[PDB]
Design a protein around this ligand. Structure first.
Ligand SMILES: Cc1cc2nc3c(=O)[nH]c(=O)nc-3n(C[C@H](O)[C@H](O)[C@H](O)COP(=O)(O)OP(=O)(O)OC[C@H]3O[C@@H](n4cnc5c(N)ncnc54)[C@H](O)[C@@H]3O)c2cc1C
Ligand SMILES: Cc1cc2nc3c(=O)[nH]c(=O)nc-3n(C[C@H](O)[C@H](O)[C@H](O)COP(=O)(O)OP(=O)(O)OC[C@H]3O[C@@H](n4cnc5c(N)ncnc54)[C@H](O)[C@@H]3O)c2cc1C
Lengths: 306, 306
């Protein structure tokens, strides 16, 4: 029966920053963090490019600060997943298991999942040699031999950036055709630090504390080999977590939530969106934090208009 | 004779975050911080809504972290103002006194100045009762009697937000006409917590450690009075620091630098813009930091295309 001012869905930097602003604005935000709360930084180690930390901070340490900061101003945080939403109209409903909650405004901050290879070693060595983010982690592989997996613009983009650091980048793709644009594909072939390895997949990532090599398989002949490398960058795409809102909020062709102009307004009145659910360009904690603030200010001012 | 990869102009959150990203990307950024370096947070006390600090941090402490973080990754920081720029073409030039520096890309991060009343007490009590940012500081005035100065949408917006906290908001304006939109003006007159005081100006802000009152003058009759209040919010407009780039980069009618779509690209190739020089909506440190990251990623990827 209680209709809250605002419900926030998600607990990465965008969700917590939206919650900090909404709570400090006395909106008493109700935040569904998920059971895998804390966003993508919970799965990494050192975060060095989030401004405000001259010697860096671990991913979980930073997310713990954000969560405690949200609590300090009165956010109501629940470590539960939203299973369904009704976002159309003056009163929006979220369903969590068999419980329901309602609000005048909803901030969507569910993020985007990086796709994974699904091979042994990939998850255990994430943050210790395996990464999905060259902007985040490429700096840690100066003068090392690394691999990049994928066939699209993402892989070309990641592989290009990594050559700023690595001694060599071996770009592996499971076919001999590339989904990447002609411009992106042509540039990497010109980059002398990049070696292409087509018709190839990783079957296992080796290493007892850190990545020491990968096991390879030829997707056509089945020939197997080993490659000594100390880094693996997985760039086979992203899946924005928009499944909840498909059919109610306009998405682009790749599933990202569309927003109006430079604002966080979605196609639905009273519904705002932030973070990597929206941004398919930068995908950083600081940009997600910024947009979560913007969504909270948009929502507060929209609520004051009602 | 040396042409740098990138020059950054400004040292608020946008500039330092751009410098952190560019330095960590091995672009060896050259940053002109200004003689009044560190941006708007140098002039405030406690910053509580920048995510990552569960008990807050002072403005200067936070900016010191950002500056040291930029240095850690190799940024070249100079506490000097850029006096003129030549931004058109493949090689851009900045002039600093009688010295010149050149770069393939330029990130503009000069911020926006809040306009001040220019009366005794205003600067000394900034951060101790005087503020230009309701989103930043309104939380500190719960159940207090405060004033807001100004006649436009900014003053209506600030005064509206402040009623979430204050016991009373007295909106003071030097005329009996208002430059604010009919909708904004009509809503505040409906807000029972707002009292309008037209044809009135502040001549002095009183208080030996914190704001304790203001001296008033009637702009028509000259009648003077005293008003006991513990907060003064100045909302008489902003001046984006775009003077350097007027005539080379497209600006909107209020002087903000225009950017393309959701990117940081300006109207000039190789020139990107971040922070409150661009954003005339949110004006927070976290949003400025986010856009400074975005400008640095845009610039890095644009540089790789050349
Ligand atoms: C391994 C790794 C390392 C990284 N390192 C860095 C780095 O060093 N620097 C940097 O700036 N960036 C880094 N990033 C990127 C950064 O973490 C992300 O860009 C950022 O966290 C995006 O924030 P977000 O809030 O939009 O989404 P997310 O971080 O993805 O958080 C969304 C959260 O909401 C939850 N959620 C989703 N759906 C629901 C639902 N239905 N109900 C409830 N909760 C839900 C999710 O479980 C998740 O906890 C890294 C990413 C990865 C994967
Ligand atoms: C009193 C006050 C309190 C605030 N409190 C908060 C708060 O609690 N939380 C929050 O999130 N936000 C707060 N803000 C707002 C926040 O500080 C700004 O939104 C943010 O700093 C904008 O960052 P920026 O990089 O775009 O620009 P700025 O902060 O304005 O920094 C620009 C810098 O570049 C320099 N520069 C300009 N032109 C040149 C040039 N030609 N050459 C060289 N250098 C140049 C300037 O001198 C300045 O140092 C506050 C603002 C004020 C004024």
């Amino acid at each position: 029966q209680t209709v809250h001012d605002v419900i926030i869905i998600g607990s990465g930097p965008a969700g917590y920053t939206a919650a900090i602003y909404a709570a400090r604005a006395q909106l008493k935000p109700l935040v569904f963090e998920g059971t895998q709360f804390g966003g993508a930084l919970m799965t990494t180690t050192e975060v060095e490019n989030y401004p405000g930390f001259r010697e860096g901070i671990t991913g979980p340490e930073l997310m713990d600060q954000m969560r405690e900061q949200a609590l300090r101003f009165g956010a109501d945080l629940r470590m539960e997943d939203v299973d369904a939403v009704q976002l159309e109209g003056p009163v929006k409903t979220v369903v969590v298991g068999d419980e329901t909650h309602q609000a005048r405004a909803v901030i969507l901050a569910m993020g985007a999942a990086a796709r994974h290879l699904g091979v042994p070693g990939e998850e255990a060595l994430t943050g210790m040699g395996v990464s999905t983010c060259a902007t985040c982690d490429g700096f840690f592989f100066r003068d090392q031999d690394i691999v990049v997996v994928g066939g699209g613009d993402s892989a070309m983009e990641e592989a290009t950036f990594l050559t700023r650091f690595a001694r060599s980048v071996t770009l592996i793709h499971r076919r001999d055709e590339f989904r990447a644009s002609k411009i992106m594909l042509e540039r990497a072939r010109a980059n002398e630090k990049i070696t292409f390895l087509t018709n190839t997949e990783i079957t296992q990532i080796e290493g007892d504390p850190k990545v020491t090599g990968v096991r390879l398989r030829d997707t056509v002949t089945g020939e197997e080999s080993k490659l000594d490398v100390t880094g693996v960058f997985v760039a086979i795409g992203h899946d924005p977590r928009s499944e909840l809102v498909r059919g109610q909020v306009e998405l682009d062709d790749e599933g990202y939530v569309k927003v109006q102009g430079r604002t966080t307004y979605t196609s639905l009145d009273g519904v705002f969106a932030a973070g990597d659910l929206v941004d398919h360009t930068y995908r950083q904690a600081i940009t997600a934090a910024g947009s979560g603030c913007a969504a909270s200010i948009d929502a507060e001012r929209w609520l004051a208009e009602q």
